[PDB]
Structures are given as structure tokens and as C-alpha cells.
């Protein structure tokens, strides 16, 4: 019920921010290939 889903929400959030860090760094490197 409303408890297993909170655990899942938090798990998904931690993976989302780990993913977003990696993708942010990739965009920063492709964008740097543009400015160079």
C-alpha cells in the first residue's frame, strides 16, 4: 500500500539524480565540442 510505494518513489528519485548528473555531464561535453 502507501508504504511500499514510498520506498519505490525514493529509489526512483535517487536513480533519477544519478542519471541526471551523468547526462548533464555528457551534454556539457557535447556542448563543449560545439564551442570548440
Amino acid at each position: 500500500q502507501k508504504s511500499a510505494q514510498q520506498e519505490l518513489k525514493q529509489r526512483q528519485r535517487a536513480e533519477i539524480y544519478a542519471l541526471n548528473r551523468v547526462m548533464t555531464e555528457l551534454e556539457q561535453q557535447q556542448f563543449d565540442e560545439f564551442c570548440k
Binding site: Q5, L8, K9, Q10, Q12, R13, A14, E15, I16, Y17, A18, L19, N20, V22, M23, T24, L26, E27, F31
Partner: protein, 246 residues
Amino acid sequence: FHVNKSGFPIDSHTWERMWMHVAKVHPKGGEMVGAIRNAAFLAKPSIPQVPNYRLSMTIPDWLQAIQNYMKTLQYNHTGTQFFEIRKMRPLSGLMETAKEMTRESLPIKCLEAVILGIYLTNGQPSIERFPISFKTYFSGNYFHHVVLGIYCNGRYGSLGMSRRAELMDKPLTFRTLSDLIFDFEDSYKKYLHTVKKVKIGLYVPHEPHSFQPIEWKQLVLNVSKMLRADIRKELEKYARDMRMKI
């Protein structure tokens, strides 16, 4: 460019399609996804405190606290937009989504940020809020972007979120709407974007009627077809119309 329509927690179909998208986009795709999914010692990201205006703050500090909050949530580079925004939905319902974003506390893109910015500035009548939408062209394709224009104490600025630092927040130092727009135009050209269309909405009411939506395109300008002088002329006339409540 997917959008999560399953709420929270994100359902299976939405979750797996996000992961396949990033696996494809990233050069080390499959190795990357395996390092994150079901990783056992992932940091639990802290939850930023939601800004709230206090009489002890200046208005620029308060609005910078709003912009820093959005930067802390981060621009969403995953390819999956996490909060569905239906643009013609009444403000009443959009404000429930904005509240939801402060609760779930996830990365956001440009439209989500405009809604957040409205939510976080509602209740301070000295700030007027209105959306500014851009349609641009870059190497064969059209791109869309929106920010929250603001007007306060005789100055224009903005709040927003973008993959670029120059296509978002602008301080309260522009003396005309035209100067604000032309600053966005000049920033866009650093990235070899041509602005095709500028759309200005109406002021977003602090106390909307139950059914009132945001109006996104009260003024629509096909800017790539016009000269500087004609663009400024039209923007200044519309801006004075706004400030008069005509």
C-alpha cells in the same frame, strides 16, 4: 522527448522507456545504465527547502531564491519530462501540479519551471508574471522554449529554466519589454538559433477565476520577417497596453 503521464511512482512502461532512451543517447550506454539501475550504494539526494517570501527579504533576493531553488532541482536531461503540464488547463489545477513538483522534488524543464515560477510568486502583487514563448530554428529544425517574464517596480526580468545559462533568468534591470526580448534574441544567436516567432501572454492573475487558464499568445510576432524598429514598436505598444490593463 517523452512525458510521464503515470504519476508517482513512475510506472513500468514509462520507467523502462526512459532507460532505453538514455542507453541509446549515451556513448557508453549499456555500461552506464547497469552502473545505476539497482546500484546498492546510491546517494539519497537531499530535498531542497521550498522558497517562501518573508518581509525580511528584498524582492531581488526572494526571486533569486526562487531561481536557485529551480537550479537545485536541476534541468532535466533524462529525456523524460516527469510532470505533465497541459497548457490550457485552468490555473487551479496547474497549481496542484506545481505543489506536486515541490513534494516529489525532481528535475524540470522549461514549461514546468514557468508553472513553478507562477506558483512561487503568487501572492506578491508587486510582481506581475507573464509567459514569453520562443520558436527558433537551428540547423534544419524548429525548437520551442518558454520563460516567465516578470515586471516589477518599472523593470522587466525573467525566471526560467533551459539547457543554456543565457536563456532563462534575467535580472530586474531591463527598462522595456523590448530590451528583455532583444536580450533573449541576442543570447539565442550565440547558439546559432534564429528566432522565428515570439509570443507574449497576459499577466497571470494572482487570484484567478476557478476556470481561468494561462493565456500564452495574446501577442504573436513573426520576428524573422520584421525589422528591429518594427519589432520594438509592436512590443512597446503591447507592453503599454498591459501596464494600462486595457
